[PDB]
């Protein structure tokens with residue numbers, strides 16, 4: 001995916017609920033720093049739904065690709081209000097940006 | 105049963121030449137009956153508890169059969185009531201009808217009672233305008249020295265507008281219209297002692313015609329036009345004369361930033377707003393209405409009507425234009441240049457009535473050599 | 475899938491009044507962007523532009539909607 | 541309402557039964573608001589949680605853009621473009 005295109009997508013559709021940097025505050029949604037390689041619902045200090053905490057998968061390019069296409073379908077009961085991103089390419093770009101931004 | 109129905113209607117002598125401006129008296133009678141009829145039917149479904157007032161009104165408009173038409177007919181009927189009231193008062197000033205002192209002064213009481221009545225009705229749905237209107241207007245009494253604040257809390261039934269206020273207002277709004285009806289019957293009885301004035305201001309005893317069938321059919325035609333105006337509003341623009349903020353339930357913690365009074369109170373609100381002093385604004389408000397009681401004492405012309413008085417006519421329309429200016433200003437924010445336009449319009453209002461018109465009267469007398 | 479809003483907005487931005495407004499907006503963007511500590515922002519210029527463009531959008535948009 | 545605010549960074553989504561009659565401009569206002577989100581102009585910086593919307597009073601709203609192309613699928617196959625979704629929800633809100 002194209003990191004720059006993904007940055008634009010993040011800023012327009014995710015930033016209002018999520019920060020990606022280390023130490024970034026939790027907002028409506030949890031801070032995403034360290035996302036890749038971590039299990040669902042493990043960011044300290046954020047009140048996740050039990051649905052998210054119990055999904056039990058590990059966040060990575062593959063799991064994110066599915067989750068972002070339709071959040072509610074992948075994690076029934078999640079309190080994340082987001083319809084999903086239909087275009088495969090857009091999800092690829094966004095995930096490429098997340099892979100970088102949540103690890104710097 | 106016959107008489108006094110009727111000799112008090114059927115064979116009532118009337119001037120042969122009264123114009124359409126004389127139709128507003130019967131139109132006011134019709135507005136009163138309309139408000140009373142739609143009012144009673146709304147009262148059959150309305151509940152005055154703050155937890156359920158707003159809700160009961162939406163229940164009327166959404167679920168009661170034809171509840172919506174009865175409601176908007178009541179809301180817009182109140183507007184028609186004022187349009188007619190202002191036309192009625194204007195007719196009186198222009199034609200010198202105020203010389204019928206008893207009829208006129210009772211009329212001033214009628215205007216005040218309808219204003220108070222409409223005020224309380226507006227509070228009933230308990231939306232934002234309802235709540236802040238209740239707050240502001242009852243507080244006018246706080247300008248009364250020594251006991252003002254006590255009177256307000258007594259009216260409210262507490263330290264702020266709340267449940268006790270809404271419940272008693274439903275009761276006051278319920279009974280006042282019937283009191284208005286009794287006062288209006290007295291209004292008419294005094295009028296019948298003299299019979300009506302006419303456009304010329306000259307006694308019409310030499311040319312009277314029976315009220316029936318001439319004015320009965322003319323009044324019916326007028327009634328039809330009133331109903332057309334009312335229904336154009338109810339069926340095509342029921343919210344045009346209303347305020348969007350009253351579709352928001354009352355919030356005691358927040359006064360809407362662009363709060364403004366019902367359109368028929370805008371001229372008086374503009375006058376009060378123009379004086380940067382509490383008591384001063386309240387007195388100016390009270391006087392803007394009560395000055396009507398002074399008109400008879402300010403009559404200087406040797407002639408009763410303004411029909412034959414050019415200068416007085418010009419000043420009369422300036423007064424109407426001025427009230428239109430104050431109405432416009434009342435709908436604008438308290439900012440420049442509206443603050444100054446409103447102050448000038450407020451000063452011009454009292455100047456036309458207290459000084460310019462009586463003066464035009466004297467000048468016209470001189471020009472006619474008497 | 476293209477939103478006609480996009481198409482229509484593009485077409486409407488071609489009007490003289492919209493270009494003029496966009497220019498004043500960019501002039502404000504340049505001026506404000508270029509200053510250390512200024513309290514000015516380009517809200518007024520943006521709203522002028524939008525008022526002109528949206529008046530045009532409102533006359534065309536629904537013609538492409540169901 | 542307290543819970544709603546808690547779930548929305550302190551902002552309160554108002555009840556929508558009368559939103560069109562409770563706002564000057566009615567559906568013209570609601571349609572414009574829904575389809576009018578845009579970037580803050582130069583010199584305007586909003587606190588986190590707020591979004592710039594030129595049609596909202598003060599231009600800083602606590603609601604993130606709620607609609608966009610394909611946000612939902614219609615029962616009748618109508619293309620769900622943002623403007624189409626805005627136009628239909630507004631028509632529904634008028635009826636409501």
Ligand code: HEC
Nearest residue numbers: 081548551552553554559570600601602603604606607629
């Ligand atoms: C929660 C994630 C939301 C979704 C989904 C939608 N809205 Fe919303 N909206 C939300 C909040 C928290 C607020 C308050 C904003 C503030 O700063 O006060 C709003 C507000 C509105 C308003 C009122 C605007 C006003 O003038 O006060 C409207 C008209 C509105 N929202 C409409 C609306 C519609 C129709 C939606 C589905 C397409 C929608 N919102 C989604 C939170 C949320």
Ligand code: HEM
Nearest residue numbers: 013014017028029040041042048049052078079080081082
């Ligand atoms: C496309 C943009 C978005 C992306 C990529 C995204 C991604 C994510 C991810 C990966 C998680 C899981 C975190 C974890 O398990 O630690 C998450 C959780 C969450 N997100 Fe988002 N998000 C986006 C937009 C949003 C938006 C717009 C909202 C809010 C309206 C939101 C609200 C939430 C909430 C509330 C949670 C926690 C949910 C729960 O506990 O069930 N997200 N998001």
Ligand code: HEM
Nearest residue numbers: 126128129130132133201202208211212214215288300301
């Ligand atoms: C609920 C309110 C009122 C009702 C029901 C009412 C009704 C009437 C009726 C039926 C008449 C005879 C027909 C006519 O000339 O119009 C009349 C005349 C009159 N009314 Fe009223 N009136 C009301 C308010 C007022 C007000 C507010 C004033 C003035 C301050 C007033 C002043 C007069 C006067 C002086 C006349 C004599 C008109 C003339 O013959 O020239 N009325 N009114």
Ligand code: HEM
Nearest residue numbers: 139140143144146147150179182222225226228229278281
């Ligand atoms: C001089 C006659 C009357 C006037 C001027 C008047 C005026 C008003 C006004 C301005 C409102 C607010 C309308 C709105 O919702 O926007 C109102 C409401 C109300 N009035 Fe009256 N009213 C009159 C007579 C009556 C009578 C006689 C009753 C009942 C026996 C009544 C019952 C009600 C009720 C139940 C409401 C609340 C429901 C509603 O808001 O429509 N009214 N009135």
Ligand SMILES: C/C=C(C)/C=C/C=C/[C@H](OC)[C@@H](C)[C@@H](OC)[C@@H](C)CCc1oc2c(O)c(OC)cc(OC)c2c(=O)c1C
Nearest residue numbers: 216219220223233236237240242364365366369372373376
């Ligand atoms: C228990 C019964 C009581 C206490 C009755 C009291 C009646 C008082 C008078 O009637 C005789 C009064 C209604 C009449 O004054 C002559 C009006 C012209 C006063 C008009 C009036 O309206 C406002 C209004 O409606 C508002 O709505 C949201 C808000 C307002 O400011 C924020 C006002 C306001 O600033 C004034 C002067």
